């Protein structure tokens, strides 16, 4: 600008972050836990224990 | 009195495991030495016989 003359802009922008697309993740073994949480699953542990 | 001894001790290992698992540190820390001591009250029958915590004969002695 101190050697030209800009306008106003046509096009207003800035940085951004650009990722390559999630895809199906392969199944993970011990992923027919994942229905529950694994706080679930450790207080059916322990409610077994204790019944 | 021997057979109600082994309830009491392994439900209090229980809990100590809970509180391990649950990490709950405090609670733990307290129950610990209540463990300790209990394991080894039933692991060393300062008695001389050695067969039972609890020992007919040995009761009955004041102390």
Same mark, same amino acid.
């Given at each position: 600008?101190?050697?030209?003359?800009?306008?106003?802009? #046509?096009?207003?922008? *800035?940085?951004?972050?650009?990722?390559?697309?999630?895809?199906?993740?392969?199944? *993970?073994? #011990?992923? #027919?836990?994942?229905?529950?949480?694994?706080?679930?699953?450790?207080?059916?542990?322990?409610?077994?224990? *204790?019944? | 009195? $021997?057979?109600?001894?082994?309830?009491?001790? @392994?439900?209090?290992?229980?809990?100590?495991?809970?509180?391990?698992?649950?990490?709950?540190?405090?609670?733990?820390?307290?129950?610990?030495?209540?463990?300790?001591?209990?394991?080894? $009250?039933?692991?060393? $029958?300062?008695?001389?016989?050695?067969?039972?915590?609890?020992?007919?004969? @040995?009761?009955?002695?004041?102390?």
């Amino acid at each position: 600008e101190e050697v030209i003359d800009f306008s106003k802009p #046509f096009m207003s922008l *800035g940085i951004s972050i650009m990722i390559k697309k999630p895809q199906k993740s392969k199944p *993970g073994v #011990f992923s #027919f836990l994942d229905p529950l949480a694994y706080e679930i699953w450790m207080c059916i542990v322990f409610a077994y224990i *204790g019944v | 009195l $021997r057979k109600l001894v082994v309830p009491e001790y @392994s439900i209090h290992g229980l809990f100590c495991l809970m509180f391990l698992c649950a990490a709950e540190w405090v609670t733990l820390g307290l129950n610990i030495p209540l463990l300790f001591y209990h394991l080894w $009250r039933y692991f060393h $029958r300062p008695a001389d016989g050695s067969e039972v915590m609890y020992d007919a004969v @040995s009761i009955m002695n004041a102390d």
